[PDB]
Every structure is written in C-alpha cells, then in structure tokens.
C-alpha cells in the first residue's frame, strides 16, 4: 500500500527509467543507472543481435540490479533482437518507433515486462489490451524520433485512457520535472537526454559537450517534410540537412547525408558530421554528473517540490 | 493572499482566463473575473472604437479585476496601447511580439504588464524593462504557438526571472495547474479549456469542434511561413496543409486564410472557419460555467498537491 507501482513491478528502488538511446545507451551507462537504483536500459538500436549479445553479457558482469533492453522497432533485425530478449531473460524491455503487437504474445509467455512507448491514446490502449506492463508516454519535447503530443497534454490523456502505470519521457531533466509528470498521472520518468551527460555514459566528450552548450532554442526538428519528424541539436550537420529538405533534396540524397550521422556523434563526436540527438532538454542540462548523483538528485528535489508525491 | 499573483492583481484564484482573439469578448472575460480569476478581453486585429465597447461592457458586468490582452501585431496596436492608459485598464498581457516600446509609457501609467514569452532572451528583457509578471506559453496551445514545449519552457523561465511566471499551453485542469507549480508556475493561463465555458459567446460549432476533438486534432498550419498556427483539423485547415504540400507561396496562402477565424466565432463555419486551439482541445470535454471550471481546477489542483501555494 502507497507503493510505487513502477518500483512493485520492476522490482527498483527509483522509479526513474533511463531511456533507450541508440547508439548512445551502451552497458556502461545502463549498468550505473541500475546501480543507482533505477532502471537501465540498453539500446538496440539498428544494431545486429551479436552486437547487443555482448552488450547484455557486459551489463551483467557490471550489476546485479534489473536492467532493460529497448527494441527499436524500425530495425532491419528486429526479430534477432526478440529472440536475444527471451533467449537471455531479459527481465524488461521498452520499444520504440513502432507497434510491436506481433511479439507481445512470445514476450508475455516467457515472463518479459513489455512497456512500449506510445504517441496516441489509440496505441496505448491497444497496448493495454495486448498485454503491456506499463506504457511511455514521449512528448514531442524528447530527442530522436518523435511523435506530435507535447508531454503536458500526452501523459494526462494516456492516464485517462489506461489503467496501466504511464511512464512520462519527453523534456524530464530534474526533481520537477519528475513532479510535474506525477501531478499529471504518471507513475514513472523516462529520461534520455540528461543521461546523455552522465560520467558514464559512453558517447565522446564532445557530445556531452554540445549538450551542455545548448540554448533554449536550439533542439531542431528535420524530417517534417517527409513522416518522420527527428529533433537533435543544431550544427552544421542538422542545419545543412533541414536546408536540403526545404530545397527537394531527393530520398536518396537525403539518405547519404544523414547514414551514419548519429554513430558520427557518438563515436567520432564529429561537431560537424555528426546528428547530436537530444531533447528541448538540452538547454536544461548544466553539468555531467554520476548517474547516482543525478537520480538521487532528481528523487529528493521531486519530494520537496512535492511531498505528497507517491514514489 | 498567499500566492504572489493573487496578491499582486488582487484575485481570489491564479488561473488567467488568456486573451482569445475574436473568441474572448466581454461575456466570458466578466465571468472569468466574477468566479475569482483574471478575466481578459482580447484585443485582436480590432480597432480602438471595438475594443472600447467591450471594457465598456465588461465594467458593467464584473468590478472584479479583469484585463485586457495588446495583440502586437494588430494594425492597430498604438491605438490599443492608447486605449488601455485612456481607459485606466490595471492589468493587460501582450502577445505575439517584443512590447518593448510601450513599457515606459505603460509603467508611467501604473499598467501591470505581462507578456507572453517564448523564449529565456525574450523573458529577461521584459523583466528588465518592468513586466509584472511572464507568461510561458508552451507550443501545446492554441493560435500563434512558439517552438518549445509547456514542459521545458515553464522551468527554463521560472529559472531566468525572479518575476513571477505563469504557465499556459495544454492546461484544461487541476493537473496541469499541479505540474505548472511543480515546474516553478505561480499561476496558470488557460485558453481553449475556456471556449467551452457556457459564458464565451462564439458559435456553438466552434464549442462543439472542440468537445469532439481527438487527441491529434490541433494540427500546425503556416510552419512555411514562419507564421505558425494551431489550429482544428477541418476542410479549411487541410486545404492550407494541402497547398503547401503543392508549394503554395505566402500570398496564396494569406489570401487563403483571410477571415477564417472569424467565420469560425460568428458564423460558426465548419468547412470556412480556422478553429484555433491547443492540443489541449482533445481533453475538453464539457461545456460549463466559468465559475464551476475554475472552482473544479483549483480544487483538484489542491487534492494532488496539498502543499500547493494557490
Ligand atoms: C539520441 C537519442 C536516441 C534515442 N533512441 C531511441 C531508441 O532507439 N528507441 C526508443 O524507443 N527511443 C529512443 N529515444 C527516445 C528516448 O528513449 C527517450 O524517450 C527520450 O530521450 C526522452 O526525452 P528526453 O530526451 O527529453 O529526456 C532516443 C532519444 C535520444 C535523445
Ligand atoms: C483561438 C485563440 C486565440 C488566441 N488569441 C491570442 C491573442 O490574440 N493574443 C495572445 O497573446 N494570445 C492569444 N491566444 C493564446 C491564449 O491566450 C493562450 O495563451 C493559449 O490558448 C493557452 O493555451 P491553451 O489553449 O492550451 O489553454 C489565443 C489562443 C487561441 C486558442
Ligand atoms: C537506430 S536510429 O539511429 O536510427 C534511432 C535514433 C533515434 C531514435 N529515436 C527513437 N524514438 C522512439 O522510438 C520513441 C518514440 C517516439 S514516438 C514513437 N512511436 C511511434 C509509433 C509507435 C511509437 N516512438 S527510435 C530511434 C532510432
Ligand atoms: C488577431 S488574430 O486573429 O490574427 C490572432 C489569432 C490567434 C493569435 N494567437 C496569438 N498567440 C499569442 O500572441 C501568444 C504567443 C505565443 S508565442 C508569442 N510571442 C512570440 C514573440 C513574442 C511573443 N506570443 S496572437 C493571435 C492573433
Ligand atoms: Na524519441
Ligand atoms: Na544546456
Ligand atoms: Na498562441
Ligand atoms: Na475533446
């Protein structure tokens, strides 16, 4: 009783989830955010099943906490990345960037917590029905890929529409943020960008760096002109590919530019070839901390914002 | 009065019923301020002689606070600023620009100004030049939206200014006011929730688009034009998106949408008009007396967040 339902079922301290984030999200960032207590999760990303193989194995050689994997649901190896989830217990996944409903059933049967994010009420009571866990209700405000529905408006009708726990992501960076999603129904945080500029995640220095200079403003949207609108940081990259879009650039040329752009960024922290994807959380994110500090941080600011707060 | 805003504008609530042009005339600016928040009578693309009438109109209908929002980009805009010092109005919020060049004349005056504000630069200049108070106006809202979210925004100003700062953009209930305290808020706006008051006085089309709107309904026209707008989807609003989807240039387009959102207050159009709300249109769900909306908010505000300092 007056217990976090996020904390009962995944079996965490914090009900703070650190977001999937290709590319960026690797074992040595999920292995500190279970460690501090909350829930990391390892992306797949794009990436074959014998990359993220490794990436399971070494997450659980760095904590005995539970972790997750995100299936991102756009990837040409999808269904090598379920088969991985159950043929390594893994004891939660999130999805993104699609409707993973053919695999809820294999998902469900072998025990995984399936907790899909959602940009509609109409999918998040799909979800619902098929059996999820909880859902992730991204506002437009988060980084990479995004749906319309800011977050404000998101979370409460997807709460209103379920009666699953909803997880708020999209522009969370601290203790209010955390407040404000609980005030408008949710039970849980997901939060990317902010990790992006933890100790240990594993992106090169100058991606957290850009992250910390970011202004207000400067977390553009390209893809607008096609189906997939994509938010990341404004550099010459981003602002070259926006301009191509406006000129009728072709599918194909567009696909040049932009093929490989994220790793760029993680890998090479190229600050001109390189898609720094990120949240209008951007601007908020000030210092590069250790994932303990940031959640213990985040936990108690929430409380003393909000005392009544049930987590 | 606790809460700085109360106390400041002399109301019993913090929730300002925002400026609505066309859409918010004396009718529901008075019942605003009758039911104990800030009432505003939007000035719009009118002229001084319309906009007189209603603060005329609305005196004899409330002696409770109320306002009066300067639409910068009015053609008529001086003559508005003219019109609130003639007229002694204590309180208006500004919209759709930098009111830089009124703010000597308006704190001569004693006019307690609050702008609207979309930005961390736009906020700190117009407390530098003596706002009252801002307004973070998330891109969830209806009409001329800025890029970034309620969210982000709220915190980001709440952190810029020592002012206070008032939260508008997607906010329909006692939840959103919650989260906008939670984000640094000492009052919150609110538009569309308040089109389906029984006191606002646009068509009943225009009421009833906005109880039926779905969860994606308020789609964003004009993001070629630099000009956006969030607006109802209907066979105006798609025809815009279908023309600049055919490369439509400005003009076309302006032409296009000449009158469209007074065909939708008064003529209630459904296929003419644009009506302009927030995805907050989708969680609108009743038509209701002011008083009842906001006695509802701040009771439920209250039940989620006992501490909360309304
Ligand atoms: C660089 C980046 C990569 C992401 N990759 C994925 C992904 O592969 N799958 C997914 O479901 N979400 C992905 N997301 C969304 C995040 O999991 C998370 O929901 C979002 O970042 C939350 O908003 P925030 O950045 O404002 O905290 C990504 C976000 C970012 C910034
Ligand atoms: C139909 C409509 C007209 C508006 N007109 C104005 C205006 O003239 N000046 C202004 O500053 N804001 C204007 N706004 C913005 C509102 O004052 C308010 O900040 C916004 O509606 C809050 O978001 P919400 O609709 O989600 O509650 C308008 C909004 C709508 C929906
Ligand atoms: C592998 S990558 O480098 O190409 C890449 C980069 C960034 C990225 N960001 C993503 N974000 C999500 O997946 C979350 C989300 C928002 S809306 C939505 N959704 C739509 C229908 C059903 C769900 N999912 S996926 C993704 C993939
Ligand atoms: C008179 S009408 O029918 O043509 C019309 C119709 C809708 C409408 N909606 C407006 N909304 C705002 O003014 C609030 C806002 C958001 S961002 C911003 N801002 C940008 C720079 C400085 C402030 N102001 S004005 C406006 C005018
Ligand atoms: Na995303
Ligand atoms: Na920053
Ligand atoms: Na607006
Ligand atoms: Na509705």
């Known amino acids: 009783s007056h217990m976090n339902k996020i904390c009962k079922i995944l079996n965490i301290k914090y009900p703070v989830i650190q977001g999937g984030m290709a590319w960026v999200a690797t074992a040595s960032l999920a292995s500190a955010v279970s460690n501090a207590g909350g829930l990391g999760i390892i992306a797949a990303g794009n990436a074959p099943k014998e990359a993220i193989k490794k990436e399971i194995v070494e997450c659980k050689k760095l904590t005995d906490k539970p972790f997750g994997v995100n299936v991102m649901l756009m990837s040409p190896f999808v269904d090598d990345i379920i088969d991985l989830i159950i043929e390594e217990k ?3 996944i999130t999805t993104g960037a699609g409707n993973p409903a053919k695999y809820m059933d294999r998902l469900k ?3 995984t917590k399936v907790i899909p994010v959602v940009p509609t009420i ?10 999820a866990t909880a859902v992730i209700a991204e506002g437009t405000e988060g980084g990479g890929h995004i749906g319309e529905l800011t977050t404000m408006v998101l979370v409460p009708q997807v709460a209103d529409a379920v009666n699953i726990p909803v997880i708020a992501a999209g522009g969370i960076v601290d203790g209010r943020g955390i407040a404000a999603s ?3 129904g949710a039970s849980a945080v997901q939060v990317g960008t902010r990790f992006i500029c933890s100790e240990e995640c594993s992106v090169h220095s100058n991606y957290k760096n850009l992250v910390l200079k970011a202004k207000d403003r400067d977390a553009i949207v390209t893809g607008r002109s096609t189906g997939h609108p994509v938010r990341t940081l404004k550099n010459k990259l981003s602002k070259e590919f926006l301009k191509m879009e406006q000129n009728g650039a072709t599918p194909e040329e567009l696909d040049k530019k932009g093929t490989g752009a994220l790793r760029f960024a993680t ?9 720094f994807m990120a949240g209008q959380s ?3 994110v000030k210092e590069i901390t250790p ?3 940031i959640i213990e941080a985040m936990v108690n600011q929430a409380r003393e914002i909000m005392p009544a707060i049930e987590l």
Not at 122 to 131: C, I, P, S, T, V
Not at 267 to 275: F, L, M, W
């Open 291 to 293: 994932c303990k500090e």
């Open 109 to 111: 049967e072998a025990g």
């Open 90 to 92: 893994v004891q939660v």
């Open 122 to 131: 109409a999918l998040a009571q799909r979800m619902e029905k098929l059996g």
């Open 267 to 275: 890998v090479d922290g190229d600050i001109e070839k390189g898609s």
């Open 182 to 184: 609980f005030a408008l």
């Open 282 to 284: 951007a601007a908020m």
